[PDB]
Design a protein around this nucleic acid. Structure first.
Ligand code: MG
Ligand code: MG
Ligand code: MG
Ligand code: MG
Ligand code: ZN
Lengths: 24, 60, 155, 117, 206, 98
RNA sequence: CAUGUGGUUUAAUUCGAAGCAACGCGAAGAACCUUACCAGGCCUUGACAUGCUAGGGAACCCGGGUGAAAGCCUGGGGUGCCCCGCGAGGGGAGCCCUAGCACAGGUGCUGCAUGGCCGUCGUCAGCUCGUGCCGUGAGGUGUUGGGUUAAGUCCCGCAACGAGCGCAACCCCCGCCGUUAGUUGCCAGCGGUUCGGCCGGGCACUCUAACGGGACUGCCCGCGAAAGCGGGAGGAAGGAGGGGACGACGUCUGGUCAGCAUGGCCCUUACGGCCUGGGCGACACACGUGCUACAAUGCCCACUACAAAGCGAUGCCACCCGGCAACGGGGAGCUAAUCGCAAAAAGGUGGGCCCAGUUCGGAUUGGGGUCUGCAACCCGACCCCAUGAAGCCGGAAUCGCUAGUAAUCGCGGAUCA
C-alpha cells in the first residue's frame, strides 16, 4: 500500500522514514 | 502595483520571509531562477542572443 | 500500417526446454513486466503436472494448446452498409495467440488460490478435451458453422 | 582540372550525370552562342514548334518537307520525301556541300551510304 | 509561425557568444547583471555612430569591452577624448578594469544589426515603407552578400488593422547550420505605436 | 608535487589552454601527467517557450562546465617562469595548489 | 482524495485562457511575503527618476512617547571639503528635512490600434519567383503525366529551362573501435596486506572526454530503360540504425496591454503608495487531468543484492549519544570522478497471512509531539497511539502506445524559509 501512513513503501513514497522505516 | 513592488522586493525591512525572489531584467514576480536571477522569459530571450555565456542549446 | 505487412516478432526460444511456444506463454502470464516471476510460475505448474500424472509437462502443454486451437472464426465486414458475420479459417499465428491467451484467462476463472495450481489444473482439462478455455474455443467454432450461410463472401 | 580532389562521390556521379544529359541534347547547339541567321529542318510539320520561334523571330525558314506538311508557313521550301534515310541523305549531303563549297576546300561527303543500310 | 531565433540556433556551431567569459556558480548572476547594464548604457550613449556586436570578455577584474561600430570616428572624437571619457563613465559606476577595444566595420550593409537599425530609423522618420525594404535588401545583395531578408510589422504608415511586409532575395536557408546568417532586430518608434523589424544576411558556408 | 585545476566552459578554449601548459611544463622541466578530463558538471535548465500558457513545445538549455586536471612533479624554476609569462587564457578560470 | 474549472455563496472569495490547441494552464512553489481583490488605519510631489528656486540643515549614529503595524510626534551625539580670513564668520560642491512648480506612478481599459514571443493545421508535402510559351482576360504552363520514395526524393517524359523558401544533409545524446591523457577503476601481473585496490606498483582493462574512423544500395545474386526495390554475405550496426534539435508561403479578427516593449484612453488627497487582518483555501453541485486501492501473480516483518543522473561551504551532513519517532545536542569530511544526500525500488532468501469489508483498502476523526518561519485558527509539513469510511474491477461513452515501446518500480533537479 503506497498510501498506508504506516508501512514500508508507505514512507518510501512519502519520501520519509520514521519508525517502521529504518533510520540512523 | 508593479513599480513600487520591484522596489519593495529589494527593501527587506522586516523579517527575511519577505525578501522573496525577484527577476532583475524585466522584474518578474515569479519563475525567477536564483542562479541567473532572471525570469524564464527574459532568460530565453538572452540565450538566443548569445549574451548568456556557457548557455548553449540543449540537445540529446 | 497501410504499406508493409509488418513482420512478426521472433521471440527468444525456451531457456529450459528449447521451444518458442513455451516462452510465449510466459509472456502472456507476464504481469507488469516480470518475466522471471512468470517463468517460475510456469515451471511451478510443470512440476504440478508430474505430481498428478507421470506425463512430461512438454507434451502436456502441446496437447492443451492444440485442443484449444480455434480452427475457424466469424469476422464482421461491411457490404454497401451492412455487417455480415462471415466465418473462415484463422491464421496459424493468431490461433496460437488466442489459444495461449484463453488458457491464461481460464486459469484466472478457476477458484484455485495459487496461480501455479490454476495453470496446472487448467492445462490438464485442456489437454483432455474439456476445460474453461476449451469450451470457449468450442463456442467460437459454433458461430462459424452457424453463420455458414454468409460464408459465400470468403474474401 | 586538379580540383577533382574534393567533391564526394555524391556530387561526383551527379555532376557526371549532369555532363551526360547536358551533352545528350545540347551537343550541336553550344557551338554557337548567338541567334542563327536561319534554320534548316527535316519536317516543318513535326518540329513546327521551333518553326514558330524562328518565324516570330523573323528568322528565315528553310526545310525539307514531305506531303505531310504546311508549305505556306515556310520561306524557302524543300519539297520531297522525308521519312527515308535515302531521301534525307541526298539532300543534307548536297546542301552542306554548298556550305563548304562557298566556304573553302571541297571535301568528300561524310560516310553515310554505309550507315544507310 | 514559429522559427526559433536563428542566432540561438547557430549559438553552438557558427557564431560564438556575443559575450564570452567564464563564471563560478557563486556570482554568475551578479557578473552577468553588471555585464548587462554595461551593454545597455553602450546602446544608449554610443548608438550615435551605430554600434552592433557589443562583444564582451571577462575572467578576473579584466573586461575586454570590444565594440564593433560602423564608424569609430565618432566613438573617439578627436585624438582621444570621446573614447577616454567613455572609459571614465564606464568604470565610474563599475569597478572592473574597463578596456574599450573599438573596431570598425568592413561594411555596414553586410552587417545585419546595422542594416536593420538603419531602415528601422527611416520608418520612424516617415519614409516609403515598402521600397525602404526593397532598397535595403538590394543594398546588401548588390554590396557583396549571398542572401538577404528583411521584414517589418505593425501599422504600416498608420492603418488600423495590422500588417507585415515580406521582402527578400538570394538564399536564406534558416534550417541549415553552416550558413552564418547574421540576425538584425530593431525597434521603430512612431507617433501611432510600435513597429517590428527583422533582417537576415547569409554569407558564410561550410 | 603540484596540481593544477582548469575549470572552464568551452572545451575548445579549454583544450588550447590545457595543451599549452602541457608543452610548456614538459619541454622545460621534469615529468607532467597530461590533461586529465573529469566528469563535466552540467546545469540542464528546462523551461517553456511562450510567455503565457503553453505546457508543451517548451525549450531547454544546458550549462557546460568542463574540468581538466594536470599534474607537475618536480618544481622546476623554468616551468614557473614559463607558465607565469607564456600564457593565453580567457574564459578559463584556473586554480592551482600543492 | 490531491489539483484545475463551471456554478453558487461572499465585504473580497483578484484577473486572464474557452472544441481540437482552456481545464496539475499563466503559477517552476498564495500562512503575512507573494498580490494585482476586500475591510479598518495613515501618506498623498509621494517607495523609484530628472530639474530648479526658496527657509533651514552637512553627512551620519543612538534613544524615546504612541500604535495592531505603518505613520504621526519628539530628544541626545555630530560638524569631513573648498574659498576669502591668524581668528570670528559665512558662502558654497555634496548629503538631508520642508515648502513650491514641471512631474512621477497605474497588475486601470483596448491582444480587432501594435512589436516581441507562443499555440495550431503538421515534419503535413508543400508554397512561390524569373524568363519563354498559350489565353481578349482572371489565369494556365513549370509543380501535371509513368515509375519510385519518409518527400515537389530521385529517375524517365514533356513548352518549357532554371532558380528560390521547404524535406533531406552539416551540430548534440546512445550504440563498434581506435589515437591522445592516466590519482576513476585495476592481483588483469607480481609481492606485501589490520585482505578495504590499503602500500608499492601498472595503464592492459572499465571508465573519464577529446579527436578521427565506419555505412556509400558500397559488394554478390534477381527485377528494371533509369531511379529504385527485393534476398544474402561482411560488419557492432544496413537501405534515414534508434533518439533530439530544425517546425516553409499562409491559416485561425487564435493567445498574451497581467513578463516586457507600446499608440490611444481614463484616474491623480486617489484607478498612485505603505501597514495590520482577511481573502485566492469560501461549498446543497457538475466537468477535466491525476494519485492511492478494490487484493493471493497479492499484503506485512527480518535479512541481502544490481542503477543513472543530478545536486551540496553560513549548504550536502560521515558517524556517536538520546528519544518508539519526526528530530534535537555533540561532532569529522567537502569550492566536492576523491567527502556527503545514499538505503534505488521492483526483485532474491526464509518466515507469518488463508479469502475475510480481511494483516486488502487508508479517507475521516480524537489525544499528544517535532522542524521551518516574527507568526501554522483560518491555512503548512511530518511523526507515534487510537480511529479503520466508500469501493469485491465500475452505465452511455471514452483515451494511450508498434520495442526497450505499453505496463510497471524507484531516484534526482529546477522551483523554494
Ligand atoms: Mg487583461
Ligand atoms: Mg480577440
Ligand atoms: Mg578506448
Ligand atoms: Mg491516546
Ligand atoms: Zn522578469
Amino acid at each position: 500500500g503506497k498510501g498506508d501512513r504506516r508501512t514500508r513503501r508507505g514512507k518510501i513514497w512519502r519520501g520519509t522514514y520514521g519508525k517502521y522505516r529504518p533510520r540512523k | 502595483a508593479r513599480k513600487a513592488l520591484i522596489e519593495k522586493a529589494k527593501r527587506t525591512p522586516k523579517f527575511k520571509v519577505r525578501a522573496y525572489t525577484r527577476c532583475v531584467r524585466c522584474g518578474r514576480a515569479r519563475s525567477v531562477y536564483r542562479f541567473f536571477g532572471l525570469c524564464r522569459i527574459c532568460l530565453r530571450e538572452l540565450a538566443h542572443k548569445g549574451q548568456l555565456p556557457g548557455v548553449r542549446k540543449a540537445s540529446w | 500500417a497501410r504499406r508493409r505487412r509488418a513482420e512478426v516478432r521472433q521471440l527468444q526460444p525456451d531457456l529450459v526446454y528449447g521451444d518458442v511456444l513455451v516462452t510465449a506463454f510466459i509472456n502472456k502470464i507476464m504481469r507488469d513486466g516480470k518475466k522471471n516471476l512468470a517463468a517460475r510460475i510456469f515451471y511451478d505448474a510443470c512440476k504440478i503436472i508430474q505430481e498428478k500424472t507421470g506425463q512430461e509437462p512438454l507434451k502436456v502443454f502441446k496437447q492443451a494448446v492444440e485442443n484449444v486451437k480455434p480452427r475457424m472464426e466469424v469476422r464482421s465486414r461491411r457490404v454497401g452498409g451492412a455487417n455480415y458475420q462471415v466465418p473462415m479459417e484463422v491464421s496459424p499465428r493468431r490461433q496460437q495467440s488466442l489459444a495461449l491467451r484463453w488458457l491464461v484467462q481460464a486459469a484466472n476463472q478457476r477458484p484455485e488460490r495459487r496461480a501455479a495450481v490454476r495453470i496446472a489444473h487448467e492445462l490438464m482439462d485442456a489437454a483432455e478435451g474439456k476445460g474453461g478455455a476449451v469450451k470457449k474455443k468450442e463456442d467460437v467454432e459454433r458461430m462459424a458453422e452457424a453463420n455458414r450461410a454468409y460464408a459465400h463472401y470468403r474474401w | 582540372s586538379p580540383e577533382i580532389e574534393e567533391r564526394p562521390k555524391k556530387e561526383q556521379v551527379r555532376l557526371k550525370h549532369e555532363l551526360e544529359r547536358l551533352q545528350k541534347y545540347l551537343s550541336g547547339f553550344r557551338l554557337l552562342k548567338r541567334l542563327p541567321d536561319a534554320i534548316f529542318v527535316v519536317d516543318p510539320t513535326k518540329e513546327a514548334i521551333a518553326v514558330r520561334e524562328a518565324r516570330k523571330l523573323f528568322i528565315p525558314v528553310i526545310a525539307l518537307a514531305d506531303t505531310d506538311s504546311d508549305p505556306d508557313l515556310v520561306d524557302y521550301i524543300i519539297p520531297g520525301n522525308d521519312d527515308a534515310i535515302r531521301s534525307i541523305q541526298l539532300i543534307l549531303s548536297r546542301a552542306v556541300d554548298l556550305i563548304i563549297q562557298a566556304r573553302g576546300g571541297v571535301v568528300e561527303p561524310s560516310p553515310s551510304y554505309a550507315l544507310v543500310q | 509561425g514559429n522559427k526559433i531565433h536563428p542566432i540561438g540556433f547557430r549559438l553552438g556551431i557558427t557564431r560564438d557568444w556575443e559575450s564570452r567569459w567564464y563564471a563560478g556558480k557563486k556570482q554568475y548572476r551578479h557578473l552577468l547583471l553588471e555585464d548587462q547594464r554595461i551593454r545597455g548604457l553602450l546602446e544608449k550613449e554610443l548608438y550615435s555612430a551605430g554600434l552592433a556586436r557589443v562583444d564582451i570578455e571577462r575572467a578576473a577584474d579584466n573586461v575586454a569591452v570590444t565594440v564593433h561600430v560602423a564608424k569609430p570616428g565618432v566613438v573617439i572624437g578627436r585624438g582621444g577624448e570621446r573614447i577616454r571619457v567613455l572609459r571614465e563613465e564606464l568604470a565610474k559606476l563599475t569597478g572592473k578594469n574597463v578596456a574599450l577595444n573599438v573596431q570598425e566595420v568592413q561594411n555596414p550593409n553586410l552587417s545585419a544589426p546595422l542594416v536593420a537599425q538603419r531602415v528601422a530609423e527611416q520608418i520612424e522618420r516617415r519614409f516609403a515603407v515598402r521600397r525602404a525594404i526593397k532598397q535595403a535588401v538590394q543594398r546588401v545583395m548588390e554590396s557583396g552578400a549571398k542572401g538577404a531578408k528583411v521584414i517589418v510589422s505593425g501599422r504600416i504608415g498608420g492603418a488600423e488593422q495590422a500588417r507585415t511586409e515580406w521582402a527578400a532575395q538570394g538564399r536564406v536557408p534558416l534550417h541549415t547550420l553552416r550558413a552564418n546568417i547574421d540576425y538584425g532586430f530593431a525597434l521603430a518608434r512612431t507617433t501611432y505605436g510600435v513597429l517590428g523589424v527583422k533582417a537576415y544576411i547569409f554569407l558564410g558556408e561550410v | 608535487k603540484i596540481r593544477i585545476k582548469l575549470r572552464g566552459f568551452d572545451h575548445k578554449t579549454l583544450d588550447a589552454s590545457a595543451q599549452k601548459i602541457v608543452e610548456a611544463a614538459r619541454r622545460s622541466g621534469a615529468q607532467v601527467s597530461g590533461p586529465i578530463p573529469l566528469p563535466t558538471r552540467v546545469r540542464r535548465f528546462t523551461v517553456i517557450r511562450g510567455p503565457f500558457k503553453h505546457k508543451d513545445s517548451r525549450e531547454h538549455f544546458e550549462l557546460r562546465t568542463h574540468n581538466r586536471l594536470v599534474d607537475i612533479i618536480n618544481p622546476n624554476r623554468k616551468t614557473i617562469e614559463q607558465l607565469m609569462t607564456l600564457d593565453l587564457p580567457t574564459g578559463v578560470e584556473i586554480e592551482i595548489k600543492t
